[PDB]
Design a protein around this ligand. Sequence first.
Ligand SMILES: O=C(O)[C@H]1CC[C@H](C(=O)N2CC[C@](c3ccc(C(F)(C(F)(F)F)C(F)(F)F)cc3)(S(=O)(=O)c3ccc(F)cc3)C2)CC1
Length: 258
Amino acid sequence: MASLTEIEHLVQSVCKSYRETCQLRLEDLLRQRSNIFSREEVTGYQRKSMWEMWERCAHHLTEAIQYVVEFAKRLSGFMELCQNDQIVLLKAGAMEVVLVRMCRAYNADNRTVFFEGKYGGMELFRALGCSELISSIFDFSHSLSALHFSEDEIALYTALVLINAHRPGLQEKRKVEQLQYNLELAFHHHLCKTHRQSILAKLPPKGKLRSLCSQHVERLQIFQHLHPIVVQAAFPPLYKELFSTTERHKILHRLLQE
Ligand SMILES: O=C(O)[C@H]1CC[C@H](C(=O)N2CC[C@](c3ccc(C(F)(C(F)(F)F)C(F)(F)F)cc3)(S(=O)(=O)c3ccc(F)cc3)C2)CC1
């Protein structure tokens, strides 16, 4: 299995799939760095209802997920996996891929993130009532900024975040293991060739991404208790499907069968 040329073709493939499926251009995110929210605009966001902020944030997250599904569809070997495994992998990895992709929209110089047209800090998200989660997200992006990833490095790393053979519920585990192995080789080969093997030890532990997702699900269940009809009426169906709590994932299935 997999010669050196198959691995080199894989590297170019994963990078191509990633470039093609990014919600935003890195070039445009970097140009907008100067475009920072005014204290009036900040006050505006801070004065918005909890449920309005959640609805806006669930919408922007659903947008990002949509592109991650597209990344998975274009990812070499993913469509060869059975529909159960496709759902298992996306249900668990899509948020994690979004969280990794997020660092590109994070400015480490100040401590701002690109949100709804301009750059703003933590204070922008005060109304959500989930300060701990917001702080965890900002630190996570901050720690990734330190590694100074290239677009190819994010491409190869997110491919692995998604193709994780240890996810509970995998039917054809061995099939995911061989796809994981080849993607790990592709990442490692590109790191070797570019003299960037050093970042491997510096990468965040698998426990840090797991906690962010767990926290998100925890905070969402609190919000759903206070405003359950906001969730029923104004939350994206794909968001409810992946986080509310072929079978119970009709939207994800339709997106895959396209
Ligand atoms: O594909 C790409 O090129 C990228 C993918 C990532 C995109 C991005 O930055 N994001 C996708 C939407 C973003 C996003 C991230 C996290 C969450 C939440 F967890 C919580 F709000 F709690 F943080 C929630 F669900 F609970 F509400 C919602 C939505 S956002 O722009 O709405 C944003 C929200 C909060 C931030 F603190 C920073 C940004 C982040 C930018 C474009």
